[PDB]
């Protein structure tokens, strides 16, 4: 079910994990030591994941901070 | 029933400081007290395209179009002055001692069992092995990480301090002393008796470490690099900052502390590569590998649980590993 | 249309509210946006005010505004291989054209 | 045996920033107290010569354009009016050990890489690469535009073991060609020194000093810095120049660009000349990228086909691949 981590360096114990559900993938912002997640977002394929992710404003870990601030957004 | 303590925390011993770098001339080496500092400055750089492509869209017109718009960039460098060929790196080091007592623990029986285990270790054999390997890491120049690579002569001077004075001075030669072979010496046995007398709590140990390296006239020194993160915001900022103190380049303290605790020659996988530093789940961040897996029985948590709770004493060298992790300190427990 | 017309509302709210635009730091990159947000003339202005910024029809802020729109919304390249970015680029072409066409008479 | 996902090679042949100081020819052997070339400002009012959209039958916009031309402030560096010789000094370390990466995931891929590079060195030495490096130190590639239009260029190279000089070389850069790598006894000696340096058989530190007759009060050409638009014209909108403490200078990576112009093995044309060694071997000024990945001469393609599959390429392409390992870089995914 688990595929990979989205970033290669943890920014204060937090990282985005990429999961697989069948015909869709599940990106999920989560703590690493504990395991409990803070927000999630469902995509259809990994091409949508990389195509959406590489369009974010930033480079390196500013991109992963913007992605964690995007997936774990206050929904209301 | 003796479960583990849910809260454990060990304060570190062997506390270093931030190393300062100042440049000067060799054979003006004994008067290295008024040397000016190495400053961090800016310069501009125009890169190109050299990264690996992808076999989904790599057209020749897109490559030439990529070369039409290159990367303009601003970095920080630190160089010696053009009339100086010697790097001076100075830091200090305290050796605290009392390396068995935690700073926070829930249980009282588990803490007393832990102190009986550590006191049993010290009474069976001293701190001579660990202080011998620490003395070898102060002997050569591990704490000169990339500055050591490609140098004519590296000289290390170590002082012991009791008051506003100097008790005993050592002067070594870092290139003659090996990088991988821990061979004995009289002076290293003296300084290993000093550090081993420090970790046992039999006195106060403050050391002053000064390192000298011939690099070349106007060459480049290598301070430690700071964290930025480009969030796509204004101005196209700097892509390489360097750590500094008040107008001097410097190295972080935890990187020197990484260079001092490279003890572990007891990997299950391969003892042919060399000693890499002491960690629970003993890992190397640059190599991307994690030696000493928990699927084996050589992890720090597994050996500590099997040696405190169940009295199953491991081999002697693994006991050196466990006590090395207690001198490292950390946040243990659940 | 509502984004660029909303930017016209931003210059609207900036225009008739804060007439004080004196000297301060940063007058090289905020100098084209200063001539875009043309304030009132100073009371100590001499006769050299009908030549200092009279010929200032600032069509460069449609270019900086174009870069802000390009960095704001994602421009897909799978729509670039199709005609969606030729028709889309036509839409931003004529819309920024009409925006600058409003900007043709900011002073005159 | 897949490729390692992380590869990184530290560079060898590490230069420093070159300093420029001006003086008089035939006072050339005492070139030790010469004053530095300083960077100063001057004002420049430029006209409009942009390629306008043609068939513009509106001359009122043209005569309107002359009413406010470009008022501009630039930096120049000139020799003093009683000096006609440019002195450019820098140093150079030759590290050696050009096969071992600094970061690698796999252990089998790294051992296969070290067997491949050690196989290359055992089959043939570093004599070719050190011969071409010796030719780029022989002439004055590192004098980029300062070389163009000069009466006589003299290069002095010193080898340093202690606070001393082991062996000194004195060349003539205009007699030595720009495109023809012809052998010589002294270039074979210095090529033995560099080849002895890259193999790890010793420590090599060189001091390179270059001399050029340009003219009294002419213009020298330091390297140019990057300007952000937070500064106005009075405030150098136009043209800043790189400097050190009150002296004009050249960046270190530009001299490092001038040293590694080896590649005479393009598939397209060997008639133009050697341009420097890059993966996807490209020229930024010409806007072209030789050595395309659609061919089979790219560095990544040859390295994958020569490490993983034991398909050894031609000998000159092996010189190209080892030249990219001496260059160093960030490889892998």
Contacts of D229 in chain C (CB under 8 A): 28-29
Nearest CA in chain A to C71: A57
User: Experimental method used, please?
Assistant: cryo-EM
Fill in the DSSP letter of residue C40. Answer: P
Does residue C96 sit in helix, strand or coil? helix
**Burial class (CB within 10 angstroms; exposed 0-12, middle 13-18, buried 19+) of B154:** buried
Question: Cβ separation of C71 and A55 shorter than 8 Å?
Answer: no
Is the Cβ of C2 closer than 8 Å to some Cβ of chain A? no
Calpha distance D318→B307 (Å, rounded): 56
**Burial class (CB within 10 angstroms; exposed 0-12, middle 13-18, buried 19+) of B165:** exposed
Nearest-Cα distance to chain C for A38, in Å, is 26
Q: What angle do CA A68, A73, A76 make, to 5 degrees?
A: 175
Domains of chain A, start order: 1-76 (3.30.67.30)
Calpha distance D277→D257 (Å, rounded): 9
Question: Cβ separation of B63 and D333 shorter than 8 Å?
Answer: no
Backbone angles phi, psi at D169, to 5 degrees: -120, 145
Give the number of residues written for chain B: 334
Say what the resolution is, in angstroms.
Answer: 3.4
Question: Cβ separation of B63 and D329 shorter than 8 Å?
Answer: no
Q: Which of B48, B64, B218 sits opposite D278 (nearest CB)?
A: B48
Give the dihedral sign, CA B121/B127/B128/B129. Answer: positive
Q: What angle do CA B178, B179, B183 make, to 5 degrees?
A: 45
Quick check: B49 and B63 in contact, CB under 8 A?
yes
Q: Write out chain B in H/E/C secondary structure.
A: CCCCCCCEEECCCCEECCEEEEEECCCCCCCCCCCCECCCEEEEEECCCCCCCCCCCCCHHHHHHHHHCCCEEEEEECECCCCCCEEEEEEEEEECCCCCCCCEECCCHHHHHHHHHHHHHHHHCCCHHHHHHHHHHHHCCCCCCCCCCCCCCEEEEEEECCCCCCCCEEECCCCCCCCCCCCCCHHHHHHHHHHHHHHCCCCCEEEEEEEEEECCCCCECCCCECCCCECCCCCCCCCCCECEECCEEEECHHHHHHHHCCCCCCCCCCCCCCCCCCCCCCEECCCCEECCCCCCCCCHHHHHHHHHCCCCCCCHHHHHHHHHHHHHCEEECC
Contacts of B236 in chain D (CB under 8 A): 228
Contacts of B230 in chain A (CB under 8 A): 58-60, 62
Which of B227, B230, B288 is best to mutate for the A interface (most A CBs within 10 A)? B230
Question: Cβ separation of B45 and D331 shorter than 8 Å?
Answer: no
Give the dihedral sign, CA D247/D252/D254/D256. Answer: positive
Question: Cβ separation of C29 and D235 shorter than 8 Å?
Answer: no
């Amino acid at each position: 079910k688990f595929i990979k981590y989205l970033s290669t360096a943890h920014l204060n114990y937090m990282n985005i994990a990429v999961y697989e559900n069948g015909s869709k993938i599940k990106a999920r912002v989560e703590n690493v030591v504990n395991g409990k997640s803070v927000g999630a977002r469902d995509f259809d394929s990994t091409e949508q994941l990389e195509s959406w992710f590489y369009g974010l404003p930033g480079s390196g870990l500013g991109r992963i901070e913007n992605a964690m601030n995007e997936i774990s957004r206050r929904e209301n | 029933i003796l479960s583990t303590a849910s809260v454990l925390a060990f304060e570190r011993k062997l506390d270093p400081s931030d190393a300062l770098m100042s440049a000067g001339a060799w054979a003006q080496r004994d008067a290295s007290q008024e040397w000016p500092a190495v400053t961090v400055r800016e310069k501009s750089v125009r890169g190109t395209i050299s990264n690996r492509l992808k076999t989904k869209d790599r057209d020749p017109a897109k490559l030439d179009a990529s070369i039409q718009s290159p990367n303009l960039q601003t970095v920080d460098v630190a160089n010696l002055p053009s009339d100086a060929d010697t790097l001076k790196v100075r830091f200090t080091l305290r050796v605290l001692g009392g390396a068995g007592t935690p700073s926070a623990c829930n249980d009282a029986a588990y803490r007393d069992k832990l102190l009986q285990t550590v006191a049993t270790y010290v009474n069976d054999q001293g701190f001579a092995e660990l202080a011998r390997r620490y003395a070898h890491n102060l002997a050569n120049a591990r704490f000169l990480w990339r500055n050591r690579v490609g140098a004519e002569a590296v000289e290390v001077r170590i002082n012991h301090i009791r008051q506003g004075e100097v008790a005993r001075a050592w002067r070594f030669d870092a290139l003659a002393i090996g990088l991988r072979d821990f061979k004995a010496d009289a002076e290293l046995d003296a300084l290993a008796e000093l550090i081993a007398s420090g970790l046992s709590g039999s006195g106060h140990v403050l050391l002053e470490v000064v390192a000298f390296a011939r690099i070349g006239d106007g060459q480049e020194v290598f301070p430690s690099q700071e964290l930025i993160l480009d969030k796509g915001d204004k101005k196209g900022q700097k892509s390489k900052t360097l750590y500094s103190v008040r107008d001097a380049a410097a190295i972080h303290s935890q990187k020197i502390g990484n260079a001092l605790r490279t003890i572990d020659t007891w990997y299950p996988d391969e003892d042919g590569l060399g000693p890499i530093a002491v960690e629970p789940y003993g890992s190397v961040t640059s190599q991307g590998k994690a030696y000493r897996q928990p699927k084996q029985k050589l992890d720090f948590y597994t050996l500590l649980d099997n040696w405190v709770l169940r009295d199953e004493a491991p081999a002697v060298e693994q006991q050196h590993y466990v006590i090395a992790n207690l001198i490292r300190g950390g946040v243990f427990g659940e | 249309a509502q984004i660029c017309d909303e930017a016209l509302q931003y210059a609207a709210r900036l225009r008739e509210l804060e007439p004080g635009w004196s000297a301060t730091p940063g007058c090289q990159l905020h100098d084209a946006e200063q001539l875009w947000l043309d304030p009132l003339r100073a009371q100590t202005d001499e006769t050299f005010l009908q030549r200092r910024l009279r010929g200032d029809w600032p069509a460069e802020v449609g270019n900086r505004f174009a870069n802000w729109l390009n960095r704001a919304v994602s421009s897909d390249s799978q729509i670039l291989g199709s005609p969606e970015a030729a028709q889309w680029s036509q839409e931003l072409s004529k819309e920024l054209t009409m925006f600058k066409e409003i900007l043709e008479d900011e002073r005159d």
